[PDB]
Amino acid sequence: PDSLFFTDGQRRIDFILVYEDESKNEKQKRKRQAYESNLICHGLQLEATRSVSDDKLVFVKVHAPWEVLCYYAEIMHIKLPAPFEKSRMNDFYILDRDSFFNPATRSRIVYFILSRVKYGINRLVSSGIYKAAFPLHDCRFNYESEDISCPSERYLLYREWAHPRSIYKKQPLDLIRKYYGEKIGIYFAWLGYYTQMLLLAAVVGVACFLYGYLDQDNCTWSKEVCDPDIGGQILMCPQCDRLCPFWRLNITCESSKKLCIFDSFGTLIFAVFMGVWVTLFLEFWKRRQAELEYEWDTVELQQEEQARPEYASAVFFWILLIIASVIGIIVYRLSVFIVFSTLTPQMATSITASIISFIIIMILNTIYEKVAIMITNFELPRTQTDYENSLTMKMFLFQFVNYYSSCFYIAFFKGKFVGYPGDPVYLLGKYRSEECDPGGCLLELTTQLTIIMGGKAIWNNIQEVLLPWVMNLIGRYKKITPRWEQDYHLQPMGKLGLFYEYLEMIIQFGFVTLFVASFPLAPLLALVNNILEIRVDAWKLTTQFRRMVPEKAQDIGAWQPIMQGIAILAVVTNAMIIAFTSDMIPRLVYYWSFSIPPYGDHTYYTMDGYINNTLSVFNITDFKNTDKENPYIGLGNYTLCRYRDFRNPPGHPQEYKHNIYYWHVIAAKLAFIIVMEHIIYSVKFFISYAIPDVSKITKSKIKRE
Amino acid sequence: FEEFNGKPDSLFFTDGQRRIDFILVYEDESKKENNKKGTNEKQKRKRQAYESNLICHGLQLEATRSVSDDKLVFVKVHAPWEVLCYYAEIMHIKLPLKFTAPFEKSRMNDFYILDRDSFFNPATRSRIVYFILSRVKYQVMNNVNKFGINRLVSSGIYKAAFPLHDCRFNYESEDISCPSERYLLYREWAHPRSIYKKQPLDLIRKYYGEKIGIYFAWLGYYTQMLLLAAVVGVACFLYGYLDQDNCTWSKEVCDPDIGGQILMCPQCDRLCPFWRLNITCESSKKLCIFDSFGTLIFAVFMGVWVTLFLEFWKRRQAELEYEWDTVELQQEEQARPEYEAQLCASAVFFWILLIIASVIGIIVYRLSVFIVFSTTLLTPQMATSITASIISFIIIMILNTIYEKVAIMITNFELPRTQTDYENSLTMKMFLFQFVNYYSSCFYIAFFKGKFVGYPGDPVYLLGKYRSEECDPGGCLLELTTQLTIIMGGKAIWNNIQEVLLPWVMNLIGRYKRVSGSEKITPRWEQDYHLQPMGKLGLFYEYLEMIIQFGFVTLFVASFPLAPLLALVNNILEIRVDAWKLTTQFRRMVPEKAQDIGAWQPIMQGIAILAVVTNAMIIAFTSDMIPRLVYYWSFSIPPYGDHTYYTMDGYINNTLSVFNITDFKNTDKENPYIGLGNYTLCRYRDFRNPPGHPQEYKHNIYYWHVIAAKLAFIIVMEHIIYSVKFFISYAIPDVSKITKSKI
Ligand SMILES: *[C@@H]1O[C@H](CO)[C@@H](O)[C@H](O)[C@H]1NC(C)=O
Ligand SMILES: [Ca+2]
Ligand SMILES: [Ca+2]
Ligand SMILES: [Ca+2]
């Protein structure tokens, strides 16, 4: 009959026990009998029905009597289904005595009852005393509940909020929490608001990108890089020793023209904007958190102590952090190296290197997860919440290093401290430092960033959950068993599913916020991913997993400190990216200072001759201070070559030393860093303190009541 | 009512069994008043209604006629138990137990009740009676209720209302039973004869309540931390002083063969001539004293010290909050709308006034220096600096009162809803005004003095005819130190003298207006009526002065390592000064309770945050350590220098720039130099290319090297300091472990 009620009886099930009979080594049967007798004596109903499919598997079900169940529910601080008390029985309207309770809360109370009893959930499940135990879903998600009394909340919830037919509709948070629990509701609300503000971020980013894209005609330095009589005549020095010849500058028109898009004033404006956008996001999330705290029953008290089966060396963890970061850097370096040792060509090279690095990161993620689990379990935590917090911190640190090591290397430690061709830097010995092209490494930073974000999102939840949908779409266009057996045939979601989902969104937030300067279109990718992910998570949760007992929570949890830390780090990261990764500061300094008769020869500020007047000069006769075999020998009548660094020309009294322009530029860079950081922090503080002038609605009405 | 009994010190009713709690003082109609007898009718009717309501509510009260003046009538008060217990229950007043609750009659037997009248301390009785007096209503006119004892005095119905002191501070109470605890407080706490013994905060709380005990405990903890700071600062200064044989650049400046030959270049237009660098040997030695690595050590030590002070203060606050069992009363909070009450324009106008205040401060300092220099024609230069600082401080003190008055008027235009709103608005506005007024000159000296003046060929004028002033080769750090020490010391001395004197002289005037030959013994209430009132603001000005002192100690310590010693002397005097003025020259303030110091806490956190920026900027720009280090590490070497190994030798000569006298352009005042015709080139403090050269007088490589070093130092210092402070805040539990046990 696929009913939710006891056999031939009016009694609503709330939780199921399934055990494997040993009668087809009696210790397991003895433990089972003891547990069952204890449950019977403690005042719970029990009924067993054998599944037709497997005679070995025998299922057991329970119920909830009003008196004892309500008493134990009042045992802990439970509000209206304001601790429960018969003295306020008629204060609140009640239409019936058998259904007024929320079935989710009934399941939660029964689960707590089972947890408190001892002798079994943990030990019996782990050791095989009981195969599994879970509550029931209202009905099949395909078709409405056959029983009229059932509201078929699962059917409506699926059809309205899980199927991608409702991709555009609004999020029904009330049903989400009233069916699943407070944790799921708060997670989905946070995800929704995050998408909402990602919309504004995406609009602003698109505006800036268009502003850049319409400036291609007025991008002087790229034009000069292309004009053959200027770009082609420049002969750059080789970037390696034994496998690179002298190259003309104009071979990088495509790179420079693309780079002028992501290296314009629009990016600077967008970085400044995101600086305050992050603060606004935090402030309004506190708004919404207060609002949900008021509107929902989020005033549940916390128990002082909890029990766990397990009831410094932290330096070892940080050593693992260091080795992980070093491994990531070596992985990226080796990937680019192997792709090298073998219009599009350089772009395809960069894309392939990024793809290989992303693959290696994907493999490394599982290993890092396993080692984090092992090490944290070796610590013997006292409780469960502390266990989750320790996992959050350690897992997040591993993911952070594993995913951002290559990006940090590209941004900062690539082409920054390479000496002039006369005395190259071999920091470790026989390991030369890589150099960026004259434009900079910003373009490959953007390529790595976009490839990683895309690949991760697309491959992960997206692709894993999405095969059947595309299969059915292509197909279209181009024995009856009770509910408990069906739910048994499902698979559980474990105890870390919500943790993993939050981890994914937090990694996405880090990608969007940290390196926003390089890639102004990142918010658009994040928005698309979120719009799909909300429905993917909803569908998987409501279709492919057993029902989870609702829990009580008031905030996302351990992540808010991580969010604010990410914001405080992101401001400085963006400042450093604009200062060092990009070549906007040298360009501005040249335009304002070195185009004037004292140093230049133009009658007015202009960008003409920036490329020629910026690149340095090197002499072959001074090939090396070590005076060994040199790659400069022969190879034509070449006598002078140029390199991307600010040093005095040969013959100057300060031979091959940093010149005035270098120090002017570095001073400008440091001034920009300090001014931008101070202004952004000041605005952050003002906005945070302006809660009364920003947030007069939510707190006022929440305190009014 | 009934006449004077004959026992002066007695604080009881004429029977001797009822303890007084308040004295209401009104002016009778017995005289021949003028204007309206109707005004007298209304005043007497209102007074009668209020007294009738109070006597109905359950408070006894009997009056008496003053012996000296016939027109003075004193009205006593008294609260029997029943009303006392009921109102304590309404107030959530807790009593000593022996899992904690306020006082209720239902649990009357559950408390350690000692005696009829003794179980309740007089301070709490006074507070309860004060609330009873405040909440009551007396009449309704224009269909709108009129209530509040405060309004009666505001409109002039009552002269005053106050509790009573135990007995004379300088003699014991004639009544044996009386504790005379005022006597003990005077003997031990006030009366600087006990300058050293630790102040008994418990008795202070008992007598004057928590509102005063919190302030005095804060001051004591402040003083101890200043002892630590003064020891460390004296150590740093002593090291700087004993290390002078190795201050090379000062030796070069003083040396007649190096410094003497440097023919510097005139600063002014034509009122000051050429001069030789060796005339600044005294200033060079002073800067060696004040501008050593000890200054950096003290800057970083103070950066840590401010945070440590804040955290330990939080721990002490928690400890005291538990010890004085203020949790339930702190939770029980209710605010009453102001008795006086019945856009962004106010804020913007306030900000404009702030800007003009800053400009006025800068201008007054500049004019003081200018006039002290003009009047010219034991070092003459230092004498001039001291004089300038003296006039600057005089003008600052004069302008402080005007700024206080303007703040009061501005905050009065806006109508804060309750007393707390008014107090917080006043706190913010007064702090901003005092900050700007006191520190505008110091900020100018530190950051805007001799920083954007061009080379002599093309002098920089701010807006015309106003040439920018510039420092000597060493810098203006010594000028800043002189300004700071003079202003801080003068503020301390003048403020302490004013605090000690003004109430005393007012009391003396009042007494000399009553030289009537009483030659008798007079009652307690009548004698306590003559003391000063301690206007409703209260400890606001005390907190303000202490906050300004802390700002001086912390913000600018990078230029004056001896500031904590001056602060220590000031505070060890101020403890007893404030105690004496509060115990011997003022009527008993009504007790209350407070969570913390008040609105000042955000001010202190802001000051601590901005101190790091101020110190970093001072060391980077005001001082000259950074150019010295740059020269030592990167310009005494073959690429630019000549010395084989790093050294400070030849720093003065190799740094001072050059200028060719005939190269003066511009048509106005063509003859600032050519008059003498002695030489053809002068040296000035700036990094620019020498004559000739493709870029004649543009900034050279050394300038940009130095600027980059300065900015890098700022970044590194700010980041490390803030990171260390954040980590320290995270690590400190912020509550005592013992208190964690007790709670
Ligand atoms: C670069 O310049 C050289 C000579 O100026 C030339 O012939 C070539 O076509 C230009 N473009 C590329 C992509 O090499
Ligand atoms: Ca997912
Ligand atoms: Ca004082
Ligand atoms: Ca004082």
Residue numbers in the entry:
A (entry chain A): 59 to 82, 91 to 147, 185 to 222, 232 to 423, 457 to 487, 503 to 638, 645 to 871
B (entry chain B): 52 to 149, 183 to 426, 455 to 489, 503 to 868
Paper text:
To further investigate these lipid densities, we combined particles from all three States and carried out focused classification around this groove in a single monomer (See “Methods”). The particles clustered primarily to 2 classes that each contained approximately 40% of the particles and rendered 3.1 Å resolution structures. The overall protein organization of Class 1 and 2 is essentially indistinguishable. However, Class 1 almost entirely lacks lipid densities in the TM1-TM6 groove, whereas Class 2 has strong density for numerous lipids in this area. This indicates that our dataset contains a mixture of monomers in lipid-free and lipid-bound states, raising the intriguing possibility that the lipid trail aligns with the pathway for lipid scrambling.
The dual functions of TMEM16F as Ca2+-activated ion channel and lipid scramblase raise intriguing questions regarding their molecular basis. TMEM16 proteins form dimers; each subunit comprises 10 transmembrane helices (TMs) and contains its own ion conduction pore surrounded by TM3-TM7. Ca2+-dependent activation involves direct binding of Ca2+ ions to two contiguous Ca2+-binding sites formed by TM6-TM8. Here, we report evidence for a lipid scrambling pathway along a groove harboring a lipid trail outside the ion permeation pore.
